[PDB]
Design an enzyme around this catalytic site. Sequence first.
Site, short mmCIF file in Angstrom:
data_model
loop_
_atom_site.label_atom_id
_atom_site.label_comp_id
_atom_site.label_asym_id
_atom_site.label_seq_id
_atom_site.Cartn_x
_atom_site.Cartn_y
_atom_site.Cartn_z
CG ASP A 189 -18.79 -13.94 -10.62
OD1 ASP A 189 -19.94 -13.81 -11.09
OD2 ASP A 189 -17.89 -14.58 -11.20
N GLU A 247 -6.40 -22.11 -13.92
CA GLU A 247 -6.48 -23.55 -13.67
C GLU A 247 -6.36 -23.88 -12.17
#
Length: 263
Positions: free
Chosen positions: A113, A15
């Site tokens: 990524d 988060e």
Amino acid sequence: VPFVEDWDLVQTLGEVQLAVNRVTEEAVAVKIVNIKKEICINKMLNHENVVKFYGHRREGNIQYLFLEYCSGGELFDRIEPDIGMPEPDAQRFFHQLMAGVVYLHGIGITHRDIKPENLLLDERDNLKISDFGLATVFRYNNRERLLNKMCGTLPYVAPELLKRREFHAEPVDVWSCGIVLTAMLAGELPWDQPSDSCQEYSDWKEKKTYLNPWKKIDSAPLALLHKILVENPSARITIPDIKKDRWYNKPLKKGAKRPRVTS
Ligand SMILES: Oc1ccc(-c2ccc(-c3[nH]nc4c3Cc3cc(O)ccc3-4)cc2)cc1
């Protein structure tokens, strides 16, 4: 200076939460959680096109990563589905992506990524590479380490990552940048994965550029994509050669409009 260390979490970003300083009102991103490596790699980083790391605090089993807040959000949200964005914007974002990737590779770090969800924009629309959770050291004591772990997001992964046991780190990041460039210019991903079982991938290797997404892309940036999205990572264009490409060096964009008056 009392209360200068106090930050208020005001909203969720991804988060990840937006934190505002109680005294100064400075905005930062705080990430709440492989993790030891993420903090270590982040401590090495300092570049205008890499999300800044301010520090970390551990509260028992919870790690708080204090990172640079990018108010412009994700590059992903500047891409109009099936359209992309104006070519000069994409060229400017691609220049900034290359500066950030050259930096990372220069200190022997591979992101692994790269995708538009991981490319953030500040208040002046400056691109910042983010999320170093999959990142690793591929060069240490000037000795290159070949990679073997499956990392990334399938539409962005290089084909060698699916076909070979070992592969060089740098061409893999170069490939995902080319998928990012494709997304920026056509507002669509060319294939689900770079494999022969993928018809779309098979058509690209057959040079069927009269099909989507390629027919939406001008021949000058398309000629660059022809050099990036090369199956053989050893024949694939390197970043120093990307920097010599004709579209890469094509004048397209005016500077940030600066306030002016007449007469
Ligand atoms: O190792 C890491 C891991 C994560 C990150 C990181 C750093 C900053 C942010 C961040 N900063 N600013 C934003 C976000 C996500 C987002 C998404 C939005 O839709 C709008 C703004 C923002 C998100 C993640 C950087 C390095």
